[PDB]
Each structure stands twice: as C-alpha cells, then as structure tokens.
Inverse folding.
C-alpha cells in the first residue's frame, strides 16, 4: 500500500518555454517608429 | 511747512531719475542667446560574420 502526494516545478531552465514568449511580435513591432518620437521631442525641445 | 514744500522738486526729479534708470537697465540686461539643433547620425561598424 502506497499513498502520498508530491508537487514538482517545471524546471524552467529546461522546460517552461515552449510558449509564445510575448516578447516577440511586439519587439519586432513598432519599437523603432515609436522610438522615432525623437522628432516630436526635438520639436518641443526647440520651442522649450 | 517750508521743508515739506520739498515734494515740488524732489518727487518728480526722483521719479524721472528712476524712469531713466529703468529705461537704460532694461535695454542693458538683454542677455542675448543663440542656439540650434541638429540630428546628425553616428555610425558604428558591425562585424559581418
């Protein structure tokens, strides 16, 4: 007769990925043109 | 009374003196500035490999 309970991690070093990793599809996304708001910042700084 | 008759000449002479002092000081403290901005680029070589 054996009766006990255990809980184990998903060892995220090995497993834990295999997902979408929402970094991508957003880092390759507008991060450049949104950064390009340097144009507007320069505009406001000129009149500042 | 004789001394209080001073206002006649001291008040407006002093007022005009302060007027000329202001009209010279405002022009004298102009503190002119001139500035410009550019967005020149900086290039750093990236190894092709």
């Amino acid at each position: 007769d054996i009766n006990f309970y255990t809980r184990q991690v998903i060892d995220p070093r090995l497993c834990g990925g295999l997902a979408f990793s929402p970094k991508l599809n957003l880092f390759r996304y507008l991060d450049a043109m949104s950064l390009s708001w340097n144009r507007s910042r320069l505009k406001i700084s000129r009149a500042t | 009374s004789l001394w209080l008759s001073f206002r006649y000449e001291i008040m407006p002479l002093y007022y005009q003196s302060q007027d000329v002092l202001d009209v010279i000081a405002n022009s004298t403290s102009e503190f002119m500035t001139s500035r410009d901005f550019v967005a020149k680029a900086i290039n750093i070589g990236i190894p092709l490999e």
Q: What stands out?
A: The longest helix of chain A spans residues 38-47. Chain A is about 30% helix and 0% strand.
